[model samples]
Target: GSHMKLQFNLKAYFKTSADPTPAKDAIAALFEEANSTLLTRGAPEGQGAKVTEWKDRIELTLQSGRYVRVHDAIFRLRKQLAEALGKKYIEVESFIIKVPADHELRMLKVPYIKSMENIEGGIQLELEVGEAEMKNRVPDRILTLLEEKIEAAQYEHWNLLWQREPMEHPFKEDPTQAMMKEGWLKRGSSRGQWIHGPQSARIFRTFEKIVLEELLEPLGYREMIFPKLVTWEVWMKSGHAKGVYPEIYYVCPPQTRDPDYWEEVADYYKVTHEVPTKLIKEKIAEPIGGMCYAQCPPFWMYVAGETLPNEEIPVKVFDRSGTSHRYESGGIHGIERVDEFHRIEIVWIGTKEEVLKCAEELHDRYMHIFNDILDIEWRKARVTNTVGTTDYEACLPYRGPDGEWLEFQNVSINGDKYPKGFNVKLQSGDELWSGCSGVGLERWAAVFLAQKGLDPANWPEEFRNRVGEMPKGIRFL
Candidate 1:
């Protein structure tokens, strides 16, 4: 069914796995035979003629060595292959699988996030080769796949917790009540908006200066300015579309991916949340904008290009003022767990061993903050990508001032895939898998709030005093 021009280019799909060669000559013969069959099948009139173009595209995908995309393309073509072969969808299923939700969640058990995302033994593979392309047209296949995967993992225990009465929260009742004492409305309007300004604004500024400038800025890190607006091209090249589409902020570019986007609006204002309190009360409740794959859009730019030619070592960055978004099912808790908030992240790239070293350094940094400044109770654990019980960060569970054990800071090694995406390298002729590890910042505040028993708005006088005076006539309203 493939187009006439496709027959000459059918040998493009071969790829080698890292460890084995499964008889290349035989596989080549089989592919050649398949190609001949496709060519000789005689392009049928009308819709049958479409296979010709599919043949060429599929071959190009295979030959280009864009292996991941190739697999994706092949998955799409499998249905067309079936149709060309004159087979119906339902009877073509050579493979299908199923699993329950809790069982699914248990599979991946990702540390802070649920585990079902990368859970084991939960994939429902089908032998209907080339079904990937044909997938969208058919309803049941997509439905079945999602249902199986979603049920397999039950990714949202949060939703489950939300379903019941407030008393049934899986976490706890009044998680921040004792620490917050009285909730500070924080401001009347952050961007000319209104809330509880006079009191809470003072606290927000104090904590911002102490934690962001005085502490984090002194830590040998540079502030990376990035475009608030994101384009689909960079997002696509990074495979972020597939990996993090569920959580990225995207913007349609009016001009271009020019540096001007940065030279202009980026440095103009540091204001994160704009608008008045009316909008905050309503619109700010849920995550705004588009997808937010993860924190550190700036960091993603760093590894976008580079291959190791010679000796290259460690590259490190730390940021305490990055904005991250997540939907909260329960009520908001001021700065502690707002819809949009800030985080301090440590992103490292270089040698694997150096990444481990960075992880240790991060642990030390947290202990100093926890044991010395914050003084909350915490336990530690080391997180790994392996699907084992100990596969989480060095857990530091501390009893909050509220007397509840909560996690503040911990480490997670995101494995080599990160480096692969960034194309960062260390030595010559070696394609290495890149990895990263970081601690969540706001969670630290939650822990610290529990530690000192000081109102979260009013920092310890030492930290408060460290903040000094506010700017005059700045119009904080």
Candidate 2:
């Protein structure tokens, strides 16, 4: 039967209306008639209702339940009462849904609850519902669902695995400020964007090459490029949308696909010589995707629904193709902590034991780079993360601007969090595990510059021997 619908979206609310109100008895009688015969008639489903009359409006409330759509009850009554009252009885769409303000407890009670925030009246909830549910389910039922789920949510905590005494940079200078002072770098008009001169750019490239040749390649991480623009589907499937939507740099395609819309905008701009910010915004659609937040999610997206033979166990891969973007909000600092940054993200898929072994081996290799090759101050530490404990071996890059000890790298275990989500399986009938290490190029360069200073002559002999002379600076207008 059509009543036994294959799908539905759930959320929460209390329904209210004004004028053309029916008697409480009449309201209950109609709803009763519908609910009582649901087993026979195969109704979409109906719930018990409590009707109250007020000076301004009438309130209809119900105990929120699965499969019981309150709007269906009101909609049923709206249609039935119209004939009984000799005209359109009430504007069913005029119903007001009262949203609830919440305890602001914890998160990861998500996918069910999209975005919850305090508004002028109360806390408004946004649910991940389909169009059919959005159209048919009254707003009240949507919110009622939210209130219950929110109360049941609990805090998700991280763990600390290892630690070392804090290390300090040899020099007391801030690399970012020094780069600005020397005209080697400048902040872009956008916050968290840096316009680097050739010297800085050269340093970035040199550091990138060093990681490629010295670290990742030697460790068997084959380089692969991932798109900077990640679609909404990937984010939702990877669970990043629900987990870190706030930090993502979301994109919205133009709402109006008409080519003439832009032509008119350009014409208006030419006449007024001013940008039509509001008009352009209105023409844009709701955010459909985002700049890549964590560079590794797309790797899982790339390998989605894939199955691997046990012999192909540990698949090591890395991507250094594009910048990763994250909205740090109030936390945005100079190049050290910014919205856009570069990283040679290394991702691997394997069994749990192989994954842990990979993590251990990467740590030793990184220590070789920081200790033996670069001769920079660094230490190892660990913290509790979403899936489990994570290893953070950080560099003491700057001692002046914001103190030192910035983490230029991180190794995290996915523990099949992604494998399960993306439907990755093993032909051997065992579960798959994954982990990754992100080597931030800018942060690495900053550490090197700060510890050894900008003089090529003063850099470590091995580094100087490998990289040779620094590239010439470009003339910036």
What is the TM-score of each predicted model, taking all chains together?
A: 0.49, 0.66
lDDT of each: 0.40, 0.66
Off by over 4 Å in 1: 1-184, 187-220, 231-240, 243-293, 308-312, 320-322, 330-332, 382-405, 429-442, 454-477
Best-fitting candidate, scored by lDDT = 2
Candidate 1 whole-model C-alpha lDDT, 0 to 1: 0.40
Cα lDDT tens digits for candidate 1, 112-195: 111123224333222233333233433234334445556434431111100111111122223245423454343223321224
lDDT of 2 by residue, 1-477 (tens): 012211222223223343435554554565456446531233444433322322234333332233444445444444555554454342222233334343443343644355665544345454554334545553544455555654554223434454544545456567788788877888887768888887888878877777788778787888788877888777777877666877877788887768886887898899999999888888788887888888887777778888888888789988888888877768457677878788888888998888888888887787777776777766655553334445444454455445546767777877888888888999988878988888888778767777777777878887887776766765567
Model 1, residue 369: C-alpha shift (Å): 1.4
Lowest lDDT sum, 10 consecutive residues, model 2, at 1-10
Candidate 2 versus truth, CA RMSD in Å, comes to 10.7
- Residue-level lDDT for 267 in candidate 2: 86
Those runs of model 2 whose alpha carbons end farther than 4 Å from true positions after fitting are: 1-170, 385-404, 475-477
